[PDB]
Amino acid sequence: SWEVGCGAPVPLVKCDENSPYRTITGDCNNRRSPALGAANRALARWLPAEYEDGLALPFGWTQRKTRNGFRVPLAREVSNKIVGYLDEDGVLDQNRSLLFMQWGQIVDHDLDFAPETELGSNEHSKTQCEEYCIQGDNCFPIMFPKNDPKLKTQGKCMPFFRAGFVCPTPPYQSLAREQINAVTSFLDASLVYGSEPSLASRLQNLSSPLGLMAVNQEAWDHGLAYLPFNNRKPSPCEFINTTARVPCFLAGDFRASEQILLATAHTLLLREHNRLARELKKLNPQWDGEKLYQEARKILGAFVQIITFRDYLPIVLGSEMQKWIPPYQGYNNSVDPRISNVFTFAFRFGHMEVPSTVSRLDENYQPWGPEAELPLHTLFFNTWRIIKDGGIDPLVRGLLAKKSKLMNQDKMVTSELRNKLFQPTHKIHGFDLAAINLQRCRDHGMPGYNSWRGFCGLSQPKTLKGLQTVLKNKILAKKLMDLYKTPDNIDIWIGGNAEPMVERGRVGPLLACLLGRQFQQIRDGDRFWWENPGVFTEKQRDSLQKMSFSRLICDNTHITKVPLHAFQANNYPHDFVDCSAVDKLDLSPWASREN
């Protein structure tokens, strides 16, 4: 017995079989088991879920049931006590560009999404939850602690709605609650093309057979493209400045306009597609609307994979890279490519990497104008700033010249995300990403810190002093222990991120294991991995290794000076070489001789 069946509410179709192109939904990747890795199926479970009532109610819900004989602390008090700080000076990561943070978020959005539950295209629950903090059904309010300033000016709580879950929607039972992943598990650039057939089509330029992706028709950027605007009303990017009224952008992933430096990357990517498609059409003039589309689309997914495995992972895992992700050896059809529920929390380490301001630089990399640097919190759902204040360039240069925040145990998440986050549904810039992350662990039913330590074959501290040694911090260890009473109860997000960093890495032992594990699996489990023999020819592969994030900027914006290594901290102008000195992608191996 297994319950095996539940293959209900999800998009299904026919396996094109032998087709050299991925499906949009990720179906048909694994032949013997066609729905592994597909958008709209449950997050995988590496360990059984731990819910309050065994089946679905999160810990903290019933105000009188303990977890291990103890009351779990309030998300927001774990925030106020451990995650907060006030001094931004000293905080910058001395050897990582602001693009280090930015790439983690693009990869993240390619791999996982647990959407909120709706049940109201009008309903008093999307307002009985915000107005009265009444816990009930999918309303699971983040209550304020006594002494939280936010009591004085905001209300009794921050509203929060539980995540969606497989099988039906309505009030549900039987099995443990399993959250949905609305995105494909494969590094396949789903964030650019969509994970659904319908959204995928809307995105395309289908008025002409050049296989181009739709581009905004209302605004231009020095004759270079922007993403289309969204039909969607109401529109939070609009609500952010009623005078400007500039809507959010339409991309293959819905979160694209969360912040300005993420809308920027989306737009460098769309631009890469269209570029690829024109170039390809020149070489092979008989190719197709569809054929141009898929071929450019296959080059792009190779891109996201190569920069990810070659440039970004080696510097997150550090010395632990070799031990979790060994060198590639071929597609293994038994490896399970599905993104695990815990990964979507482990991958939240990047939160502690976001700094507090965003800069715009002019052509010599000098402060563009008088209001160059801005508080991150005015940039949530802000598109009016790209469109009406210089477009993309001034904002890509800041990504190469400025630095990510460094995780630090006494400074974890800047207040910009911690006190001032705009959620695209509600009205204020007053949410807290840290508390939300914690409340979210609980909703998704996560095993505690020791469970995962156990999982990764690392010691499990049971006492103050043990916790002190693992964390190599006396004080942090003391706060955690005062809020939680036992390490067994420490939520994985805050435990994972509290560990000191492995050598040359930017996460700890627990985090290197869960990430390292996930990445090995999605590479080993992907029939379309770029080095998978028979997916690109040997000469195409040789061409694809020369790609770099720098080139991408050269070919797609008017920046003429860039770093060679783009994730490392780089000083202008010593570290900046001219575009000409940067290897170009040689598209000639994609030539198709008819006779």
Ligand X SMILES: *[C@@H]1O[C@H](CO)[C@@H](O[C@@H]2O[C@H](CO)[C@@H](O)[C@H](O)[C@H]2NC(C)=O)[C@H](O)[C@H]1NC(C)=O
Ligand Y SMILES: *[C@@H]1O[C@H](CO)[C@@H](O[C@@H]2O[C@H](CO)[C@@H](O[C@H]3O[C@H](CO)[C@@H](O)[C@H](O)[C@@H]3O)[C@H](O)[C@H]2NC(C)=O)[C@H](O)[C@H]1NC(C)=O
188 binds Ca ion (CB under 5 A): yes
335 binds ligand X (CB under 6 A): yes
Phi, psi torsion values for 135, nearest 5 degrees: -70, 140
Mark whether 574 is an active-site residue.
Answer: no
Spell out where 406-530 has E strands.
421-422, 429-431
Q: Which residues on neighbouring strands pair with residue 429, listed in sequence order?
A: 422
Residue 151 CB partners (closer than 8 Å, separation 6+): 144
Residue with tokens 């050299």: 20
- In angstroms, the CA 343 to CA 518 distance is 7
Choosing from 109, 266, 351, 377, the catalytic residue is: 109
Residue with tokens 């450019």: 296
547 binds ligand HEM (CB under 6 A): no
Instruction: Give the one residue of 95, 205, 357, 460 binding ligand X; rule: CB under 6 A.
Output: 205
Contact predicate 339/111, CB 8 Å:
yes
Query: Which of the choices ligand X, ligand HEM, Ca ion, none does residue 212 contact, using the CB cut-off of 5 to 8 A by kind?
Result: ligand X
One character per residue 157-196, x = contact with ligand X (rule: CB under 6 A): ----------------------------------------
Residue 22 CB partners (closer than 8 Å, separation 6+): 29, 186, 188, 298, 301, 528
Query: Which of the choices ligand Y, Ca ion, ligand HEM, none does residue 584 contact, using the CB cut-off of 5 to 8 A by kind?
Result: none
Query: Which of the choices ligand X, ligand HEM, ligand Y, none does residue 117 contact, using the CB cut-off of 5 to 8 A by kind?
Result: none
Query: Which of the choices ligand X, Ca ion, ligand Y, none does residue 184 contact, using the CB cut-off of 5 to 8 A by kind?
Result: Ca ion
Contact predicate 99/311, CB 8 Å:
no
Q: Is the peptide bond before 73 cis (omega within 30 degrees of 0)?
A: no
DSSP state of 468: H
Nearer to ligand X, 64 or 282 (CB): 282
Query: Which of the choices Ca ion, ligand Y, ligand X, none does residue 335 contact, using the CB cut-off of 5 to 8 A by kind?
Result: ligand X
112 binds ligand HEM (CB under 6 A): yes
Query: Which of the choices ligand Y, ligand HEM, Ca ion, none does residue 356 contact, using the CB cut-off of 5 to 8 A by kind?
Result: none
Determine the size of the site formed for ligand X (CB under 6 A).
10
- In angstroms, the CA 345 to CA 351 distance is 11
- In angstroms, the CA 12 to CA 169 distance is 18
545 binds ligand Y (CB under 6 A): no
190 binds Ca ion (CB under 5 A): yes
**Nearest approach, Cβ of 258 to ligand X (angstroms)?**
24
Determine the size of the site formed for ligand HEM (CB under 6 A).
21
Residue 48 structure tokens:
């059984």
Instruction: Give the one residue of 11, 568, 577, 579 binding ligand Y; rule: CB under 6 A.
Output: 568
- Of 225-264, binders to ligand HEM (CB under 6 A) are 258-259
- In angstroms, the CA 381 to CA 246 distance is 10
**Nearest approach, Cβ of 113 to ligand HEM (angstroms)?**
5
Total count of residues recorded for the chain:
595
How many other CB atoms sit within 10 Å of the CB of residue 92? 16
**Nearest approach, Cβ of 111 to ligand HEM (angstroms)?**
8
DSSP state of 185: S
Query: Which of the choices Ca ion, ligand HEM, ligand Y, none does residue 110 contact, using the CB cut-off of 5 to 8 A by kind?
Result: Ca ion
- Of 225-264, binders to ligand Y (CB under 6 A) are 241, 243-244
Residue 253 structure tokens:
């992933």
Nearer to ligand Y, 244 or 483 (CB): 244
Nearer to ligand HEM, 225 or 263 (CB): 263
Nearer to ligand HEM, 378 or 468 (CB): 378
520 binds ligand X (CB under 6 A): no
**Nearest approach, Cβ of 184 to Ca ion (angstroms)?**
4
How many other CB atoms sit within 10 Å of the CB of residue 154? 14
Residue 98 CB partners (closer than 8 Å, separation 6+): 261, 355, 398, 399, 400, 402, 403, 404
DSSP state of 591: -
**Nearest approach, Cβ of 308 to Ca ion (angstroms)?**
11
DSSP state of 174: S
286 binds ligand Y (CB under 6 A): no
Residue at shortest CB range from ligand Y? 244
Angle of helix 289-306 relative to helix 98-111, nearest 10 degrees, comes to 120
HEC string of 392-410 equals CHHHHHHHHHCEEECCECC
**Nearest approach, Cβ of 579 to ligand X (angstroms)?**
25
Rounding to the nearest 10 degrees, give the CA dihedral for residues 463, 469, 474, 480: -50
Closest CA to 467 of 500, 437, 440, 493: 500
N-to-C CA span, the chain: 57
**Parallel/antiparallel/unpaired status of strands 421-422 and 429-431:** antiparallel
Closest CA to 38 of 230, 257, 197: 197
Closest CA to 339 of 135, 564, 519: 519
- Of 212-251, binders to ligand X (CB under 6 A) are 212, 214-215, 217
**Nearest approach, Cβ of 401 to Ca ion (angstroms)?**
30
565 binds ligand Y (CB under 6 A): yes
Query: Which of the choices Ca ion, ligand HEM, ligand Y, none does residue 364 contact, using the CB cut-off of 5 to 8 A by kind?
Result: none
Instruction: Give the one residue of 62, 174, 332, 459 binding ligand X; rule: CB under 6 A.
Output: 332
**Nearest approach, Cβ of 274 to ligand HEM (angstroms)?**
26
Contact predicate 511/407, CB 8 Å:
no
- In angstroms, the CA 595 to CA 385 distance is 52
Instruction: Give the one residue of 184, 190, 340, 344 binding ligand HEM; rule: CB under 6 A.
Output: 344
- Of 66-105, binders to ligand HEM (CB under 6 A) are 101, 104-105
Q: Name the segment binding Ca ion (CB under 5 A); options: 177-185, 278-286, 336-344, 575-583.
A: 177-185
- In angstroms, the CA 547 to CA 55 distance is 47
388 binds ligand Y (CB under 6 A): yes
Q: Which residues of the chain form contacts with ligand Y (CB under 6 A)?
A: 95, 241, 243-244, 315, 384, 388, 504, 565, 568
Active site positions, annotated? 109
Q: Which residues of the chain form contacts with Ca ion (CB under 5 A)?
A: 110, 184, 188, 190
Q: Which residues of the chain form contacts with ligand X (CB under 6 A)?
A: 205, 207-208, 212, 214-215, 217, 332, 334-335
Q: Which residues of the chain form contacts with ligand HEM (CB under 6 A)?
A: 101, 104-105, 108, 112-114, 258-259, 344, 347-348, 350-351, 353-354, 417, 433, 436-437, 440
